[PDB]
From a paper:
In an attempt to prevent ansamycin binding, we made the switch loop more rigid by Gly619 and/or Gly621 to Pro substitutions. We assume that the Gly619Pro and Gly621Pro substitutions induce a switch loop conformation mimicking a transition state during wild-type L to T conformer conversion while the HMW drug is bound to the AP.
The [name] AcrAB-TolC drug efflux pump contains the inner membrane H+/drug antiporter [name] comprising three functionally interdependent protomers, cycling consecutively through the loose (L), tight (T) and open (O) state during cooperative catalysis. [name] is the homotrimeric IM proton-motive force-driven H+/drug antiporter component which recognizes and actively transports multiple drugs (antibiotics, detergents, dyes, and solvents) via the tightly connected AcrA and TolC channels across the OM, leading to an observable resistance phenotype. Four different entry channels (CH1–CH4) have been described with putative entrances from the periplasm or the outer leaflet of the IM toward the two drug-binding pockets, the access pocket (AP) and deep binding pocket (DBP) inside the [name] pump. Here, we present 13 X-ray structures of [name] in intermediate states of the transport cycle.
Numbering used by the authors:
A (entry chain D): 11 to 166
B (entry chain B): 1 to 1034
C (entry chain A): 98 to 241
D (entry chain A): 290 to 337
E (entry chain C): 50 to 97
F (entry chain C): 866 to 913
The structure:
């Protein structure tokens, strides 16, 4: 962990586009990670900062970087309903079937929070609809348990 | 009335004697404290939820209590903190003048009815309702030097053998332990628990069974069988008393018949209730007592009594234990008293010298030497009657009134000495005529000065309570001075002064006093010639007056505003702030570096560093700490370079090097509740259930905009904490039910192990203390450790936590704030250099009206009080000016002549502003009260010039210029005498650099400069004012 | 009679009775008030558009207005002309019997699965040497 | 339905209620509006 | 209920008594703890 | 009882001083007061 690495983590989180720009020019470590294993891309994905997700990927950020529990930026973006960031991550080669330590995928998380637009995008980029978590649950099992009629019909 | 007492000097002496005894009695019985109660009454509700996060605390404790704080009288506002230390503090602030006891009992009564709605673990810990205050009398440190005791061991010894005795000590109002009494700590091992198919649930169940009080009954209890001879109580099971007994608690009997005891699955020791704080004093383990002074108590007596009780405890102290006094106010308060008594005594000595220099007889010098003490003693008797204390504000209030008290004495005696010299009348007849000339004016002056000072007592809020201390002190001293001037002083003059033959001005004397009288008589003719010339060309002086008025107005706007000067109190604070999520050990390494700096780079200045790791003022997570620095005595720190302000700046500059840690030193404020000079306290409020995240975005939007106006706003930051990574674990209900694992067993196992659990009480050497079960550190540090905790299913199989749970990283708040029941975020800031708080607040309001839908705002603390204190000022200034005018109108029997007196105001103010500006001081409370007394004395000088002038025109039919010239001639000597005595009297306060010099400098500087100009200008300008005002109106 | 002291004396005695009262009565909150029997005023709340039902308005008043009015000095008592929203579980006895469940089972489950658990911390005090991670553990939270 | 606290001033309390309602109005949902169907204080104010 | 005088003193009487400090006009405090579990703490205040 | 006895001397002392000062004021004399106040022992011995 470097001085500019810490500055980039804080800037990526806060959504300060202009500060990230200056930090990219000075070569702030894009693979900088905090104690839980979150990169600037993780943080930008979580808090929904589209411009910074794009700028970090341009500057050779790991699109499939995983935290200490095996969660990727696509997991975060899919879970918190950031449609534009999900599309960008998938276009820059994000593993659509990425499994965390619980066996949970972006499709599982999106299904759980009922993000219909995101579920369609994930399925479009070839998300495994039959993918089971550690409890043997699919995105379909989540849709019927949540009682989401629209979602259950799409996961046919 | 003066005539009455000239013929009755014994009656006069009797009145002086009664006043002296009343004052003498008051001096002995009057309370003593550094500062009186200023801040409006506040009641704090405090609750602990062991192992609870900010949201859990907020949504199960804080919201329920807040919803039940209804039907309570005189509530201004309500604010709360819920943080991830498992702590809630709700603060209810009440209208100034509210009974603090009624406020507290009303709050705790409404809480009592809300207690059944709180979680069982919160009801078990309890919910404290306390009168809020931050002023400690002193902090007693208790350390161990031979390395045989931890902070936990010292805390328990202090709690068991010291705290109660100090609480019982005379004048002690409250005592806070810096630590807890011991708890029985059961440190659980999950490997051993799983080995014998046991969980924390079984540990808790066994402790409640085998550590308990059990009711039995009596032998031969009523109603008995008739003939029963013996009646005795049956004692059954009573609470355990030792780590040995807790160790032997039976958990399981195995198939083969071997016993599983609690010591087989846990480490068992006496430890602290909490491990959040790590206290060190010069690197050595430390506890201590925070002692507050009781209402109406004498601070000096209490401090002596505390040290007397600590002395009695010395012989029983375990080896290595030692008392230290890192903070004690009473040395400072003792120096304040000494310095004030010194100033009042020097003032009386200087009046004696000036009185002899001019009047040159010892009988004259004795009259003020009697009169001034009588007034000062009388003033204490009236303070006592109003229920005031001898404090910094009331003591310096008397110092600021010295000029007014000295003048009343000098005016009466000097005028008798003149009347005798000019007319040849004997003392008694001379005193009658002399009082005849001034007695009407003295009463007029009393009413005018009442009109000036009395309205100062009716400002609301904290600043009002401060101004009220000076107002009553000064009005009382002034009021008694006039009573003594009309009763005692005339009687003393009539009976003590020797006659002076008509024409004898001591010009015929030899030596210094002959030369002086010749010089001063010659100087008086030079003065009357100058006024003669000034009065021939009054036009250019009205021009010079407006230049002064404009210069005054200009200097007023440029002079930075403040409350009370910073002081060298031999102590200051160092703040240690690490990045969010930083651990206790990382914070400890920075504090070790900060402590090492002070005992190395400032070994000459620093006596001790009190390092409190895991303590902050806006939340106490693991990434925060403070170093409380105590300095060596003032005597051993000579020069400005070795004072708190210089050490502070040096420390801050050195520590700015420290990487990944915000560290800075700062002096303590005079009174904490007033806040910073032109600071504001803003609340951003969620008014439409937006939630934490949308309110954060709104906060950032406001902060971003505030940063774009550095011309108006400076250091606009949040007071709270930023969201941090947290470990969300989801229990799969289906998997739990499938394996036959109850959710109670899962939630207890997790909570008990990782969070800790208060089970019940035991009795340690005759003292009831708490029993906590918790995981030993090494099994609750990292996410992988979650899988090492097992829960027994219905069928008896041990199921790991991994089998029925899933986890992920998310962000959440470690401290959630609420204002008047709604989610809030406190924003601090201050007006830019040259800008007023009003302007800064006006912009913040403008910026706030541009935030998203459902985001409101309010002002709190100093900002709430400023809005309500600022709106009163115009009314109080107006009432003061109107009543002054009306009193002078009644005195002079004229609507016009009053203006000639009132025009003097700027002549004093200009000198005060020049002296303050030049010396680099601020427009503070001491300076402001200084202006009123300077205005007061110059007004008094002017009143008597105009009375003498007007009387000569009315009675002796003299001309305007003739009357004015004869008036200023007669008033020259008394005006110069008062000014020479008083200026010399405040000279020590101006040059002072010792302890309490900040206050002395603030009192002295403005008064000295103000008196210099007030004296020099008024003697030339008052005659101009009178001539111009008489000409313009007939 | 000083109404403050009357209330204080009445409540000191009530607190002796409180623990003997049924737990259902304790949990509804017992209130002690010093007010007139008559209404000072009635503050009415309507929706001129007609976007909100009687029940929706009553909830808004209860959740956003009542508390701040109730804390205002001189307000001795505040009566809501309506009800704050609760989570209503309207049970069906045919379906409960069909799955061999009772209201007791329903209540047990709601207490078990609508819980706010204190779960402690990773790297919480007292910690081991060299600990770098310090994070709150978040388990079950209240259902929304 | 608001009842006056024992010994409290009706008019001062009514003013404080109105001032607190004034702070809530700006954050109301669309259509929601305060009406004053029963107030005993206006008569006291007007009759004096 | 059921607690001896010593038990009652340690768990109740001393707990209450060590909080009966910083009260205005307190002349003296007396207390008894008995075998039936009963505590009585009388605080006598100055005249007036 | 301890309080009553402890404060009695100061009560007599202040009472004598007040009566003296009152007499000094009313009769514009020190001699009349001193002359009168010497009578007090003549009364007090009879009471004892
Ligand atoms: C606050 C509002 C609330 C309501 C309060 C109501 C009461 C208001 C105060 C009442 C004051 C009125 C005074 C009455 C005096 C009557 C005596 C008339 C005779 C006379 O010439 O006065 C001599 C004294 O005055 C003198 O010789 C004095 C010198 C001349 C005037 C001096 C002016 C005093 C200073 C004014 C300060 C401003 C005050 C503002 C309120 C006494 O002569 P004698 O009768 O004993 O002789 C024997 C003759 N046979
Ligand atoms: C930095 C401090 C500055 C403070 C401001 C200065 C004001 C205080 C000093 C006053 C000094 C007065 O000094 C006085 O001035 C007047 C000017 O009108 C002189 O008067 C002179 O001019 C007038 C007008 O033409 C003639 O009538 C007169 O015969 C002549 O002597 C006096 O002879 C002189 O003694
Ligand atoms: C045992 C004695 C207890 C004393 C309690 C002290 C209370 C202080 C709590 C707040 C500390 C947090 O720090 C914050 O408040 C300080 C108040 O002292 C501010 O300090 C401010 O006021 C001081 C008044 O003496 C000035 O000397 C500083 O120049 C000024 O900046 C800091 O700029 C700010 O960073
Ligand atoms: C903030 N304060 C002045 C100090 C200073 C030095 C200290 O060494 C300590 C404190 C606060 C006190 C608060 C007390 C509190 N109480 C009086 C028991 C307390 O309940 C807690 C707590 N975390 O709840 C403590 O940490 C505490 O035990 C503690 O360890 C402290 C402590 O050790
Ligand atoms: C604390 C108690 C206060 C009592 C004060 C008593 C007054 C004296 C105090 C002692 C100071 C020393 C000098 C005092 C002289 C003093 O009081 O006595 C002088 C003569 O007794 C006067 O006699 P008299 O003929 O009545 O004269 C009156 C003229 N009309
Ligand atoms: C003789 C005429 C004196 C009139 C001035 C008296 C004003 C005092 C009003 C008051 O009670 O407020 C006290 C206030 C509290 O902060 O103390 C002060 O701040 C001092 C105010 C000095 C103002 C100088 C006026 C110059 C232009 C005329
Ligand atoms: C002798 C001086 C009396 C002073 C009384 C001051 C009372 C004025 C009240 C100020 C508040 C007005 C707000 C508009
Ligand atoms: C401490 C009180 C001292 C009182 C002494 C005053 C004596 C006054 C006598 C004056 N005389 C009547 C003789 O003129
Ligand atoms: C607020 C009232 C101020 C009083 C002013 C009275 C002035 C009267 C002038 C009469 C001129 C003849
Ligand atoms: C708030 C009360 C103010 C009253 C001030 C009166 C002072 C008179 C002293 C003699
Ligand atoms: C030429 C200016 C004369 C001024 C002299 C004033 C004398 C004042 C003595 C106190
Ligand atoms: C026992 C302390 C007395 C201090 C008196 C101070 C007088 C200004
Ligand atoms: C004649 C003097 C008047 C004094 C009243 C206070
Ligand atoms: C009790 C002694 C009184 C005597 C006064 C002269
Ligand atoms: Cl002499
Ligand atoms: Na539970």
């Amino acid at each position: 962990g470097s001085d500019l690495g810490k500055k980039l983590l804080e800037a990526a989180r806060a959504g300060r586009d202009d500060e990230v720009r200056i930090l990219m020019a000075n070569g702030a470590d894009v693979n900088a990670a905090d104690v839980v294993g979150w990169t600037p891309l993780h943080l930008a994905a979580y808090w929904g900062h589209l411009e910074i997700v794009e700028v970090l990927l341009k500057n050779g950020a790991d699109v499939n970087a995983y935290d200490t529990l095996g969660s990727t930026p696509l997991h975060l973006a899919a879970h918190f309903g950031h449609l534009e960031i999900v599309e960008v991550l998938l276009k820059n080669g994000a593993d659509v079937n990425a499994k965390d330590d619980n066996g949970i995928t972006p499709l599982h998380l999106a299904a759980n929070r009922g993000h219909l637009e995101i579920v369609e995008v994930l399925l479009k980029y070839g998300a495994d609809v039959n993918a089971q978590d550690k409890f043997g649950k699919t995105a379909f099992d989540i849709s019927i348990n949540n009682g989401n009629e629209d979602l259950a019909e799409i996961l046919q | 009335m003066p005539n009455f007492f000239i013929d009755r000097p014994i009656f006069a002496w009797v009145i002086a004697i009664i006043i002296m005894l009343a004052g003498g009695l008051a001096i002995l019985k009057l309370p003593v404290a550094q500062y009186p109660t200023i801040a409006p009454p506040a009641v704090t509700i405090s609750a602990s939820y062991p192992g609870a996060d900010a949201k859990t605390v907020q949504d199960t404790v804080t919201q329920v209590i807040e919803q039940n704080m209804n039907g309570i009288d005189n509530l201004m506002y309500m604010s709360s903190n819920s943080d991830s230390t498992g702590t809630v503090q709700i603060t209810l602030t009440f209208e100034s003048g509210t009974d603090a006891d009624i406020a507290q009992v009303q709050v705790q009564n409404k809480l009592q009815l809300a207690m059944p709605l709180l979680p069982q673990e919160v009801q078990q810990q309890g919910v404290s309702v306390e009168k809020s205050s931050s002023s400690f009398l002193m902090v007693v440190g208790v350390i161990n030097t031979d390395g045989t005791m931890t902070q936990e061991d010292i805390s328990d010894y202090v709690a068991a053998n010291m705290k109660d005795a100090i609480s019982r000590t005379s004048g002690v109002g409250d005592v806070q332990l810096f630590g807890s009494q011991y708890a029985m700590r059961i440190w659980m091992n999950p490997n051993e628990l799983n080995k014998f198919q046991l969980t924390p649930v079984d540990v808790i169940t066994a402790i409640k069974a085998q550590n308990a009080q059990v009711a039995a009954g009596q032998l031969g209890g009523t109603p008995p069988v008739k003939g029963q001879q013996l009646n005795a109580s049956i004692i059954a099971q009573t609470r355990l008393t030792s780590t040995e007994e807790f160790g032997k608690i039976l958990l399981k009997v195995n198939q083969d018949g071997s016993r599983v005891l609690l010591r087989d699955v846990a480490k068992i020791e006496l430890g602290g209730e909490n491990y959040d704080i790590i206290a060190e004093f010069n690197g050595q383990p430390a506890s201590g007592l925070g002692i507050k002074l009781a209402t109406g108590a004498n601070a000096l007596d209490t401090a002596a009594a505390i040290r007397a009780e600590l002395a009695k405890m010395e012989p029983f102290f375990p080896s290595g234990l030692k008392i230290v006094y890192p903070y004690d106010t009473t040395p400072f308060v003792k120096i304040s008293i000494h310095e004030v008594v010194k100033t009042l005594v020097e003032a009386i000595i200087l009046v004696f010298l000036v009185m002899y220099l001019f009047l040159q007889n010892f009988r004259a010098t004795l009259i003020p030497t009697i009169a001034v003490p009588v007034v000062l003693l009388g003033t204490f008797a009236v303070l006592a009657a109003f229920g005031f204390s001898i404090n910094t504000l009331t003591m310096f209030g008397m110092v600021l009134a010295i000029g007014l008290l000295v003048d009343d004495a000098i005016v009466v005696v000097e005028n008798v000495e003149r009347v005798m010299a000019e007319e040849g009348l004997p003392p008694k007849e001379a005193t009658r005529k002399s009082m005849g000339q001034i007695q009407g004016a003295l009463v007029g002056i009393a009413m005018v000065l009442s009109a000036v000072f009395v309205p100062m007592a009716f400002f609301g809020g904290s600043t009002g309570a401060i101004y009220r201390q000076f107002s009553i002190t000064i009005v009382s001293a002034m009021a008694l001075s006039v009573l003594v001037a009309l009763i005692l002083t005339p009687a003393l003059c009539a009976t003590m002064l020797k006659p002076i033959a008509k024409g004898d001005h001591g010009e015929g004397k030899k030596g210094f006093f002959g030369w002086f009288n010749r010089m001063f008589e010659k100087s008086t003719h030079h003065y009357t010639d100058s006024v003669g010339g000034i009065l021939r060309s009054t036009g250019r002086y009205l021009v010079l007056y407006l230049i002064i008025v404009v210069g005054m107005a200009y200097l007023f706007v440029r002079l930075p505003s403040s409350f009370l000067p910073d002081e060298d109190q031999g102590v200051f604070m160092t703040m240690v702030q690490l990045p969010a999520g930083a651990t206790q050990e990382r914070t400890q390494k920075v504090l070790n570096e900060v402590t090492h700096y002070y005992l190395t780079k400032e070994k000459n200045n620093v006596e001790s560093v009190f390092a409190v790791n895991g303590f902050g003022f806006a939340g106490r997570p693991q990434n925060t700490g403070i170093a409380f620095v105590s300095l060596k005595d003032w005597a051993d720190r000579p020069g400005e370079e070795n004072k708190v302000e210089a050490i502070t700046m040096r420390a801050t500059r050195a520590f700015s090097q420290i990487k990944d840690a915000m560290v800075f030193a700062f002096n303590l404020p005079a009174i904490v509740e007033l806040g910073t000079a032109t600071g504001f306290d803003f609340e951003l409020i969620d008014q439409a259930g937006l939630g934490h995240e949308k309110l954060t975005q709104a906060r950032n939007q406001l902060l971003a905009e505030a940063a774009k106006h550095p011309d108006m706003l400076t250091s606009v930051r949040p007071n709270g904490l930023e969201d941090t990574p947290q470990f969300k674990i989801d229990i799969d209900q289906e998997k739990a039910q499938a394996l036959g694992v109850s959710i109670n067993d899962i939630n207890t196992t997790l909570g008990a192990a990782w969070g800790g659990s208060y089970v019940n009480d035991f009795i340690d050497r005759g003292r009831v203390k708490k029993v906590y079960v918790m995981s030993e550190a090494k099994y609750r540090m990292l996410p992988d450790d979650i899988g090492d905790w097992y829960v027994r299913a219905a069928d008896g199989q041990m199921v790991p936590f991994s089998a029925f749970s899933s986890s992920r990283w998310e962000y959440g708040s470690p401290r959630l704030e609420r204002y008047n029941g709604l989610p809030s975020m406190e924003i601090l800031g201050q007006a830019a250099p040259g800008k007023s708080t009003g302007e800064a607040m006006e912009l913040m309001e403008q910026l706030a009206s541009k935030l998203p839908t459902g985001v409101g705002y309010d002002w709190t603390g100093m900002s709430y009080q400023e809005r309500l204190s600022g709106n009163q000022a115009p009314s109080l200034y107006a009432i003061s000016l109107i009543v002054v005018f009306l009193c002078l109108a009644a005195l002079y029997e004229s609507w016009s002549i009053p203006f000639s007196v009132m025009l003097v105001v700027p002549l004093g103010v200009i000198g005060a502003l020049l002296a303050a500006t030049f010396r680099g001081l601020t427009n503070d409370v001491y300076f402001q009260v200084g202006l009123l007394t300077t205005i007061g004395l110059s007004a008094k000088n002017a009143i008597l010039i105009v009375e003498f002038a007007k009387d000569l025109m009315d009675k002796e039919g003299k001309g305007l210029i003739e009357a004015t010239l004869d008036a200023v001639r007669m008033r020259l000597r008394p005006i110069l005498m008062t000014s020479l005595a008083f200026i010399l009297g405040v000279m020590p306060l101006v040059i002072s650099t010792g302890a309490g010099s900040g206050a002395q400098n603030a009192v002295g500087t403005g008064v000295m400069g103000g008196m210099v100009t007030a004296t020099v200008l008024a003697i030339f300008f008052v005659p101009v004012f009178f001539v111009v005002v008489r000409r313009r109106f007939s």
